[PDB]
Every structure is written in C-alpha cells, then in structure tokens.
Short mmCIF file of all heavy atoms in Angstrom, two decimals:
data_model
loop_
_atom_site.label_atom_id
_atom_site.label_comp_id
_atom_site.label_asym_id
_atom_site.label_seq_id
_atom_site.Cartn_x
_atom_site.Cartn_y
_atom_site.Cartn_z
N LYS A 82 10.18 -6.31 -6.61
CA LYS A 82 10.24 -7.62 -5.97
C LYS A 82 11.41 -7.69 -4.97
O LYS A 82 11.30 -8.33 -3.92
CB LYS A 82 10.39 -8.69 -7.05
CG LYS A 82 9.45 -9.87 -6.92
CD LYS A 82 9.29 -10.55 -8.28
CE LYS A 82 9.27 -12.08 -8.19
NZ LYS A 82 10.51 -12.64 -7.56
N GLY A 83 12.51 -7.04 -5.30
CA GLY A 83 13.64 -7.04 -4.39
C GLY A 83 13.35 -6.05 -3.27
O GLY A 83 13.29 -6.41 -2.09
N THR A 84 13.14 -4.79 -3.67
CA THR A 84 12.87 -3.69 -2.75
C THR A 84 11.84 -3.98 -1.65
O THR A 84 11.97 -3.49 -0.51
CB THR A 84 12.41 -2.46 -3.54
OG1 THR A 84 13.01 -2.48 -4.84
CG2 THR A 84 12.83 -1.18 -2.84
N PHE A 85 10.81 -4.77 -1.96
CA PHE A 85 9.75 -5.09 -1.00
C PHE A 85 9.81 -6.51 -0.43
O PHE A 85 8.94 -6.94 0.33
CB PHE A 85 8.38 -4.82 -1.63
CG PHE A 85 8.20 -3.39 -2.06
CD1 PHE A 85 8.41 -3.02 -3.39
CD2 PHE A 85 7.92 -2.40 -1.12
CE1 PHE A 85 8.35 -1.68 -3.77
CE2 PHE A 85 7.87 -1.06 -1.49
CZ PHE A 85 8.09 -0.70 -2.82
N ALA A 86 10.87 -7.23 -0.81
CA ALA A 86 11.10 -8.60 -0.36
C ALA A 86 10.94 -8.78 1.15
O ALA A 86 10.11 -9.57 1.59
CB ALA A 86 12.50 -9.05 -0.79
N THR A 87 11.73 -8.04 1.92
CA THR A 87 11.70 -8.11 3.38
C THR A 87 10.40 -7.61 4.02
O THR A 87 10.02 -8.06 5.10
CB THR A 87 12.92 -7.36 4.00
OG1 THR A 87 12.48 -6.59 5.12
CG2 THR A 87 13.59 -6.45 2.98
N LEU A 88 9.71 -6.69 3.35
CA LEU A 88 8.45 -6.19 3.88
C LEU A 88 7.33 -7.19 3.59
O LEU A 88 6.37 -7.32 4.35
CB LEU A 88 8.12 -4.82 3.29
CG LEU A 88 8.79 -3.62 3.97
CD1 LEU A 88 8.68 -2.38 3.10
CD2 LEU A 88 8.14 -3.40 5.33
N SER A 89 7.47 -7.91 2.47
CA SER A 89 6.48 -8.90 2.10
C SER A 89 6.40 -9.96 3.20
O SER A 89 5.33 -10.25 3.70
CB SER A 89 6.83 -9.53 0.74
OG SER A 89 5.71 -10.20 0.17
N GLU A 90 7.53 -10.52 3.62
CA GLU A 90 7.49 -11.54 4.66
C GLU A 90 6.83 -11.00 5.93
O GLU A 90 5.98 -11.66 6.54
CB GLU A 90 8.91 -12.01 4.99
CG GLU A 90 9.66 -12.70 3.83
CD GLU A 90 11.15 -12.85 4.11
OE1 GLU A 90 11.81 -11.82 4.43
OE2 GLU A 90 11.67 -13.98 4.01
N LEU A 91 7.22 -9.79 6.30
CA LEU A 91 6.70 -9.13 7.50
C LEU A 91 5.17 -9.03 7.54
O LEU A 91 4.54 -9.57 8.44
CB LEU A 91 7.33 -7.74 7.62
CG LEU A 91 6.61 -6.68 8.47
CD1 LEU A 91 6.60 -7.06 9.94
CD2 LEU A 91 7.31 -5.37 8.27
N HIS A 92 4.59 -8.32 6.58
CA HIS A 92 3.14 -8.16 6.55
C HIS A 92 2.41 -9.48 6.36
O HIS A 92 1.27 -9.64 6.81
CB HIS A 92 2.72 -7.21 5.43
CG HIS A 92 3.23 -5.81 5.59
ND1 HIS A 92 4.53 -5.46 5.31
CD2 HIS A 92 2.61 -4.68 5.99
CE1 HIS A 92 4.70 -4.17 5.53
NE2 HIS A 92 3.55 -3.67 5.94
N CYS A 93 3.07 -10.43 5.69
CA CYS A 93 2.48 -11.73 5.39
C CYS A 93 2.58 -12.74 6.52
O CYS A 93 1.59 -13.03 7.21
CB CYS A 93 3.15 -12.32 4.15
SG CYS A 93 3.44 -11.10 2.84
N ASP A 94 3.79 -13.27 6.71
CA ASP A 94 4.03 -14.27 7.73
C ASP A 94 3.88 -13.71 9.14
O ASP A 94 3.40 -14.40 10.05
CB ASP A 94 5.43 -14.86 7.55
CG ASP A 94 5.74 -15.22 6.11
OD1 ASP A 94 4.86 -15.03 5.24
OD2 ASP A 94 6.87 -15.68 5.85
N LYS A 95 4.28 -12.46 9.33
CA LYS A 95 4.20 -11.84 10.66
C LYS A 95 2.89 -11.13 10.98
O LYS A 95 2.20 -11.48 11.94
CB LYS A 95 5.36 -10.85 10.85
CG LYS A 95 5.11 -9.80 11.96
CD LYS A 95 5.83 -10.13 13.26
CE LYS A 95 7.33 -9.96 13.08
NZ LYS A 95 8.06 -11.04 13.79
N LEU A 96 2.55 -10.13 10.18
CA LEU A 96 1.35 -9.34 10.42
C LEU A 96 0.00 -9.97 10.05
O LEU A 96 -1.00 -9.73 10.73
CB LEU A 96 1.50 -7.98 9.74
CG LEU A 96 2.59 -7.12 10.39
CD1 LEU A 96 2.93 -5.95 9.49
CD2 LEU A 96 2.13 -6.65 11.76
N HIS A 97 -0.01 -10.75 8.97
CA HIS A 97 -1.23 -11.41 8.51
C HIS A 97 -2.21 -10.46 7.85
O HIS A 97 -3.43 -10.61 8.01
CB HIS A 97 -1.93 -12.12 9.66
CG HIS A 97 -1.31 -13.42 10.04
ND1 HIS A 97 -0.34 -14.02 9.26
CD2 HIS A 97 -1.54 -14.25 11.08
CE1 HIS A 97 0.00 -15.18 9.81
NE2 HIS A 97 -0.71 -15.34 10.91
N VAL A 98 -1.70 -9.48 7.11
CA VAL A 98 -2.57 -8.54 6.42
C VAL A 98 -3.00 -9.16 5.10
O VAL A 98 -2.17 -9.52 4.28
CB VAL A 98 -1.86 -7.21 6.14
CG1 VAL A 98 -2.78 -6.28 5.37
CG2 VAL A 98 -1.46 -6.57 7.44
N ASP A 99 -4.30 -9.32 4.91
CA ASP A 99 -4.78 -9.87 3.67
C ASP A 99 -4.28 -8.98 2.53
O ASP A 99 -4.42 -7.75 2.56
CB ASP A 99 -6.30 -9.92 3.68
CG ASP A 99 -6.86 -10.53 2.42
OD1 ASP A 99 -6.41 -10.16 1.32
OD2 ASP A 99 -7.77 -11.37 2.53
N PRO A 100 -3.69 -9.59 1.49
CA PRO A 100 -3.17 -8.84 0.35
C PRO A 100 -4.18 -7.90 -0.30
O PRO A 100 -3.81 -7.05 -1.11
CB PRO A 100 -2.72 -9.94 -0.60
CG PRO A 100 -3.67 -11.03 -0.28
CD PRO A 100 -3.66 -11.03 1.21
N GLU A 101 -5.45 -8.04 0.03
CA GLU A 101 -6.45 -7.15 -0.57
C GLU A 101 -6.26 -5.73 -0.05
O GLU A 101 -6.40 -4.75 -0.79
CB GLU A 101 -7.87 -7.64 -0.27
CG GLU A 101 -8.95 -6.71 -0.80
CD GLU A 101 -8.86 -6.48 -2.30
OE1 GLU A 101 -8.13 -7.26 -2.98
OE2 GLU A 101 -9.52 -5.52 -2.80
N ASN A 102 -5.92 -5.60 1.23
CA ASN A 102 -5.73 -4.28 1.81
C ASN A 102 -4.54 -3.53 1.16
O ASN A 102 -4.39 -2.33 1.34
CB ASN A 102 -5.58 -4.39 3.32
CG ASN A 102 -6.71 -5.20 3.93
OD1 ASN A 102 -7.86 -4.76 3.98
ND2 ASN A 102 -6.38 -6.40 4.40
N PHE A 103 -3.72 -4.24 0.39
CA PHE A 103 -2.62 -3.57 -0.30
C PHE A 103 -3.17 -2.80 -1.51
O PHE A 103 -2.68 -1.72 -1.83
CB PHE A 103 -1.58 -4.56 -0.80
CG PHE A 103 -0.87 -5.33 0.28
CD1 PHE A 103 -0.58 -6.68 0.12
CD2 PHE A 103 -0.45 -4.69 1.45
CE1 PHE A 103 0.11 -7.38 1.10
CE2 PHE A 103 0.24 -5.40 2.44
CZ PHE A 103 0.52 -6.73 2.26
N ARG A 104 -4.17 -3.37 -2.20
CA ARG A 104 -4.75 -2.66 -3.34
C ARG A 104 -5.47 -1.45 -2.76
O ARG A 104 -5.45 -0.38 -3.35
CB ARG A 104 -5.76 -3.54 -4.10
CG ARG A 104 -6.28 -2.89 -5.41
CD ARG A 104 -7.19 -3.80 -6.24
NE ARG A 104 -8.45 -4.08 -5.56
CZ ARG A 104 -9.44 -3.20 -5.38
NH1 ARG A 104 -9.33 -1.96 -5.84
NH2 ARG A 104 -10.53 -3.56 -4.72
N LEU A 105 -6.11 -1.63 -1.60
CA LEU A 105 -6.83 -0.56 -0.93
C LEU A 105 -5.90 0.59 -0.47
O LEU A 105 -6.18 1.75 -0.74
CB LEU A 105 -7.62 -1.12 0.26
CG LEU A 105 -8.82 -2.03 -0.06
CD1 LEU A 105 -9.58 -2.42 1.20
CD2 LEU A 105 -9.75 -1.28 -0.99
N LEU A 106 -4.78 0.29 0.19
CA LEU A 106 -3.93 1.39 0.62
C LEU A 106 -3.41 2.21 -0.55
O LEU A 106 -3.21 3.40 -0.42
CB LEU A 106 -2.74 0.91 1.44
CG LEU A 106 -2.01 2.13 2.00
CD1 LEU A 106 -3.05 3.08 2.64
CD2 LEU A 106 -0.98 1.71 3.01
N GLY A 107 -3.21 1.57 -1.70
CA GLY A 107 -2.73 2.29 -2.86
C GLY A 107 -3.77 3.22 -3.49
O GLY A 107 -3.46 4.36 -3.88
N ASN A 108 -5.00 2.75 -3.62
CA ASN A 108 -6.03 3.60 -4.18
C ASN A 108 -6.30 4.76 -3.20
O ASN A 108 -6.60 5.87 -3.62
CB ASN A 108 -7.29 2.79 -4.50
CG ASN A 108 -7.10 1.94 -5.74
OD1 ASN A 108 -6.38 2.33 -6.66
ND2 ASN A 108 -7.75 0.77 -5.78
N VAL A 109 -6.15 4.50 -1.90
CA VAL A 109 -6.32 5.57 -0.93
C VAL A 109 -5.23 6.62 -1.24
O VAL A 109 -5.54 7.80 -1.36
CB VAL A 109 -6.18 5.06 0.52
CG1 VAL A 109 -5.75 6.21 1.47
CG2 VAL A 109 -7.49 4.45 0.98
N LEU A 110 -3.98 6.18 -1.39
CA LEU A 110 -2.85 7.06 -1.69
C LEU A 110 -3.17 7.89 -2.92
O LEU A 110 -3.09 9.11 -2.90
CB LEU A 110 -1.56 6.26 -1.97
CG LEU A 110 -0.35 7.18 -2.28
CD1 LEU A 110 -0.18 8.16 -1.11
CD2 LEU A 110 0.93 6.39 -2.48
N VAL A 111 -3.53 7.22 -4.01
CA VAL A 111 -3.88 7.94 -5.22
C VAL A 111 -4.97 8.97 -4.88
O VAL A 111 -4.97 10.08 -5.42
CB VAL A 111 -4.40 6.97 -6.30
CG1 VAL A 111 -5.12 7.75 -7.39
CG2 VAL A 111 -3.23 6.19 -6.90
N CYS A 112 -5.88 8.63 -3.98
CA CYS A 112 -6.91 9.60 -3.63
C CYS A 112 -6.30 10.81 -2.93
O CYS A 112 -6.77 11.94 -3.10
CB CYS A 112 -7.99 8.98 -2.74
SG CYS A 112 -9.22 8.03 -3.65
N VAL A 113 -5.24 10.55 -2.16
CA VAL A 113 -4.54 11.60 -1.41
C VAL A 113 -3.72 12.51 -2.33
O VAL A 113 -3.64 13.72 -2.09
CB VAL A 113 -3.62 10.98 -0.34
CG1 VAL A 113 -2.65 12.02 0.19
CG2 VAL A 113 -4.48 10.47 0.80
N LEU A 114 -3.12 11.95 -3.36
CA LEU A 114 -2.35 12.76 -4.28
C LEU A 114 -3.29 13.71 -5.03
O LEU A 114 -2.95 14.86 -5.29
CB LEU A 114 -1.60 11.87 -5.27
CG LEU A 114 -0.66 10.89 -4.58
CD1 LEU A 114 0.05 10.09 -5.62
CD2 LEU A 114 0.33 11.63 -3.71
N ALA A 115 -4.49 13.22 -5.36
CA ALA A 115 -5.46 14.06 -6.05
C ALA A 115 -5.99 15.18 -5.15
O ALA A 115 -6.28 16.28 -5.61
CB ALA A 115 -6.62 13.20 -6.54
N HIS A 116 -6.10 14.89 -3.86
CA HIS A 116 -6.59 15.87 -2.89
C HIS A 116 -5.58 16.98 -2.57
O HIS A 116 -5.95 18.03 -2.05
CB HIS A 116 -6.95 15.17 -1.58
CG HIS A 116 -7.73 16.03 -0.63
ND1 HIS A 116 -7.71 15.84 0.73
CD2 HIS A 116 -8.57 17.07 -0.85
CE1 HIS A 116 -8.51 16.71 1.31
NE2 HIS A 116 -9.05 17.47 0.37
N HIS A 117 -4.31 16.74 -2.89
CA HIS A 117 -3.28 17.72 -2.59
C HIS A 117 -2.85 18.50 -3.80
O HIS A 117 -2.57 19.69 -3.70
CB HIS A 117 -2.07 17.04 -1.96
CG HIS A 117 -2.27 16.70 -0.51
ND1 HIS A 117 -3.52 16.52 0.04
CD2 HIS A 117 -1.38 16.50 0.49
CE1 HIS A 117 -3.40 16.22 1.32
NE2 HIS A 117 -2.11 16.20 1.62
N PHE A 118 -2.80 17.83 -4.95
CA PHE A 118 -2.38 18.48 -6.19
C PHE A 118 -3.55 18.80 -7.10
O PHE A 118 -3.35 19.22 -8.25
CB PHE A 118 -1.39 17.58 -6.93
CG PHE A 118 -0.17 17.24 -6.14
CD1 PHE A 118 -0.25 16.42 -5.02
CD2 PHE A 118 1.08 17.70 -6.54
CE1 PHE A 118 0.90 16.06 -4.31
CE2 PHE A 118 2.24 17.35 -5.84
CZ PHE A 118 2.15 16.53 -4.73
N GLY A 119 -4.76 18.61 -6.59
CA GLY A 119 -5.95 18.86 -7.38
C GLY A 119 -5.67 18.62 -8.85
O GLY A 119 -5.07 17.61 -9.21
N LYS A 120 -6.08 19.58 -9.67
CA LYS A 120 -5.93 19.56 -11.12
C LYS A 120 -4.57 19.12 -11.68
O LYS A 120 -4.47 18.71 -12.84
CB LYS A 120 -6.32 20.96 -11.63
CG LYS A 120 -6.28 21.18 -13.12
CD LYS A 120 -7.04 22.46 -13.46
CE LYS A 120 -8.57 22.26 -13.35
NZ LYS A 120 -9.11 21.51 -14.53
N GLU A 121 -3.51 19.19 -10.88
CA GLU A 121 -2.20 18.76 -11.37
C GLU A 121 -2.19 17.23 -11.42
O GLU A 121 -1.48 16.63 -12.23
CB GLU A 121 -1.06 19.26 -10.48
CG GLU A 121 0.28 19.43 -11.25
CD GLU A 121 1.47 19.86 -10.36
OE1 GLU A 121 1.30 20.78 -9.51
OE2 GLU A 121 2.57 19.29 -10.54
#
C-alpha cells in the first residue's frame, strides 16, 4: 500500500487504467515466468 501509493494515483487519476487490467498484467507476468523457467 505504501510502495505503490504514488503509482496508484498516477494510473488512476492520471492515466485512467481500469483496475481490471491490473489483474490482467499480473496473470500475464505469471505466464511469462512459466515460459522462462518452465518446470521450475
């Protein structure tokens, strides 16, 4: 909550990114970690 405080205002009040795309960017990331470390 602290660490992302300043970024929250930015994407929200400034950028207008629907918070749904945040769940999406994370699952994409998880997909990327699996694609690089395969079985690990």
